[PDB]
């Protein structure tokens, strides 16, 4: 059968690969951008390539092998380092000058961890129907016996680092049942390894794709005509007999099936018109799940003024304004001598920030850094890079997040095809939504679902 | 039967009243503070009594009579004014000065409203168990077809105005099914009347209390020994045989039943120890519901620099930072010539703000005001009042908000009695949680459940 795959991100390439492996090779991969990889995408910043999107292989060293790890660590040997968050207590900056007492912070972290652990126990007891699910915030109130969760600046930044920095939305909107504990870590291990390779984390996608798409023997570039870049799908027309897909450049294509890999955000946006309209159950499932945004703001300085050394990689800024430029990273290992800092924000801050100029953001950041390093002569960042994923119509966000209110059945409706319209992507990952490995496995499962239906008529 | 009622806010006074009415007069109302009224409470600010807490009779002029209205507007004749929000479109300030074009704003309002109305239709269809509920935000995304709800400064303050300003938590945390549409408005009417009377909205509570508790003929002060103020209940021991209640000043009382009217926030804070501990199902119901915080920041100025006149009472600041000092009210009618402004914040901002000095807050607000009225010489507020309800142990917030995640059954468990321990309060209002009328009605309802057990020996609840 001919299958059109919309999008050449991890899941699209992964799905096409799986299809090809089932022998469905009459594929047409339509990618909106001029490159493949989607959310795994590097860029030159300050003479170095940094990841605008995914940057870690998360869930390593556990009881099950994270499928991406071997590709990263062995097959491609992409340069990488395990992140050590053990020294956070030594790196929590007071809103107005210097770090807090490490012991004080370590206890706050401990309480936080302890609470989450109790949340994990509780989570295990909830009913599969999700009927007793609650937001993580609700669990925190319950375990701490307070009418609120973390509310002091230190508690909040700890909270933000523990949750928002992972999920990109606050605990209060987050489904406890579906995030605590998280399969990714529960299955693959608690370690996470930061990929810092000039080839880019995206090399993983390119590798997969080269396993079945044609590439130039010298160039190495993919030249397979089954991959068409700069093809923005804008319409997918389907019937019991097949589908037609129209691209922004006005090309029109036909196939027996279409595998949609565009992000949940893209699906929530109307960039693609389905005709007929997706059924209500589908639409509701789509709109009920969350497409989070996680913005990696890179900054380059004329000189270092922050600490480097053991436990220095990650540091938090305990602003009284929850989530305000709170999580920082310095790359003494990754990009030795670059004088680059990375501050991450999400959700509301991400949308506010994407909406203002880089200069304005730089200026806000300079004020924070100055407040952070009052003793130093903090030079103004020479360059800043503000990824605008939510604003990018081909992503409209960085990764899904599971909100309280959505249960599994409904999450699964996300994965459900509609007639000949199949879906794949991290937000369709049965247990790894939000990750590269989730996009990866999702391409596989989605393809297998189409394969059984299409090849064995077992739908 | 002797009944101890914990708390003399609206629900406790209302409950005790209903009990008294069913002939249960062997009552003891233990009030933590030196006064009754709880969340209905005024205070002198810069020479005028403004309300720290409830300020409106919400839901007026509808198909059904808000029980609170007649007392306020007729029995007591408390001074009050219908809030008119029809001119908001002319009153939305730009983060960086002046107001937005009215037509532009009106359109955004109309969109917001239309999404909401579409949400009301969806809501009607949701399974009554609450099992298909979703957040208001989800409904917004669905209807706007965006991966986010309002996200520009203007749509956001409009959204905040429409929701956070009513519920004190964001749409994304709020149960659609339980708040859109809102019964208070559907049943009692869309209007709201702001009480601006030196006697305070709490007069309603003093009035009811007075219907059954003894008062001094000249002072009119309640002098009934059944009301004991400054009695903070710290422990409630209950058994098949009865209940014992202990106050912080070591007083110990015994009764057949106890009726707890303390806020959800108090319940979530362990101020009162129950012995035996409440059942897990109860505990969970308690923690899952939300106790919101709504902070009425009053500011006093040496002179007026904002507009007054038609449609001027309410104005919004379209901050690019959602919920940042966004909803303003000027008191040309309520406190004429006082030069007071009220900016309302809730939730995260409330918590942040309660935790820092009023001076710091005032300075934040001054910068906002100067950005809003760059053409004026905005004088620094000479006075500011930041109500700290979340920090107050007898309240731990302002009012409950039904969050996405609490289902019908869970909410009922929140209300359910445990043995001889009954619960009441706005957070136990079946359809009016979060309101004065909900507290009022909840008092009567819990009283009735208690009356059936006590008088009709009908003790099984749901
Ligand atoms: C900032 C950020 C941080 C993250 N952190 C990490 C991390 O450290 N570790 C981790 O494991 N995961 C992380 N993730 C999550 C991970 O990157 C994603 O889950 C994964 O790459 C999603 O791949 P996917 O194929 O589902 O979607 P995508 O990568 O979005 O692929 C979808 C593709 O469809 C294309 N497309 C969209 N619309 C159209 C259209 N109309 N027509 C045609 N093509 C279209 C897009 O251009 C894209 O190439 C991060 C992501 C981001 C963005
Ligand atoms: C800032 C704010 C704004 C609001 N806006 C409005 C509005 O405009 N309109 C509206 O309808 N509603 C509004 N509400 C909600 C309304 O005021 C409340 O719903 C209602 O007053 C609550 O009454 P209650 O009896 O349920 O609780 P409360 O008024 O809290 O009564 C509980 C009583 O118990 C006391 N107590 C607590 N702990 C103990 C203890 N351990 N022992 C003894 N006594 C104890 C408390 O002191 C209090 O007196 C607002 C409330 C606040 C605070
Ligand atoms: C990631 O890959 C490196 C690459 O080899 C691993 O380090 C090697 O592990 C083998 C296994 O016994 C040793 O014999 C080699 O001497 C090691 N090489 C180096 C350079 O140390 C490493 O353990 C891998 N990490 C994970 C998490 O799998
Ligand atoms: C609030 O109360 C006032 C007090 O009566 C109401 O105004 C009275 O309404 C009757 C009804 O027609 C008139 O005959 C009186 O002349 C009115 N009095 C005044 C002073 O105008 C008023 O309508 C009430 N408002 C609401 C919303 O109930």
Account of the 3D structure:
2 copies of one chain form a homodimer. Chain A has 459 residues and is of the alpha/beta class. The first copy, chain A, has 2 domains: 1-83 and 183-288 and 408-459, FAD/NAD(P)-binding domain (3-Layer(bba) Sandwich), CATH 3.50.50; 84-182 and 289-407, Polyamine Oxidase, Chain A, domain 2. Chain A is 32% helix and 20% strand. Chain A has helices at residues 10-21, 68-75, 102-125, 136-144, 153-167, 183-188, 203-210, 264-268, 280-288, 347-354, 358-372, 408-415, 436-454; strands at residues 3-6, 27-30, 42-45, 48-51, 56-60, 80-82, 92-94, 191-195, 227-228, 233-238, 243-247, 252-255, 257-260, 273-275, 290-292, 294-300, 314-318, 327-330, 340-346, 383-385, 399-401, 421-423. In chain A, the strands form 6 sheets. Chain A has a 6-stranded mixed sheet, sandwiched between helices. In chain A, β17 and β18 (327-330) form a beta hairpin. In chain A, α1 runs parallel beside α7. The two termini of chain A are 15 Å apart. The A-B interface holds A 129, 131-135, 138, 141-142, 145-148, 151-152, 172-173, 264-266, 268-270, 283-284, 287-288, 291, 320-322, 348, 351-352, 355-356, 390, 396-397, 403-406 and B 131, 133-135, 137-138, 141-142, 145-148, 151-152, 172-173, 264-265, 268-270, 283-284, 287-288, 291, 320-322, 348, 351-352, 355-356, 390, 396-397, 403-405, 407. The complex binds flavin-adenine dinucleotide (2 copies) and a molecule of 2 linked components (NAG-NAG) (2 copies). One flavin-adenine dinucleotide binds at residues 6-12, 30-33, 38-40, 53-56, 58, 231-233, 261-263, 266, 271-272, 294, 296, 389, 394-395, 398-399, 425-426, 434-436, 438-439 of chain A. Chain B: InterPro entries: Amino_oxidase, FAD/NAD-bd_sf, Flavin_amine_oxidase, Flavin_monoamine_oxidase. Chain B: Pathway: Amine and polyamine degradation; spermine degradation. Chain B: Glycans are attached at residue 73. Chain B: Its EC number is 1.5.3.14, 1.5.3.15. Chain B: Substrate binds at residues 58, 166, 434.
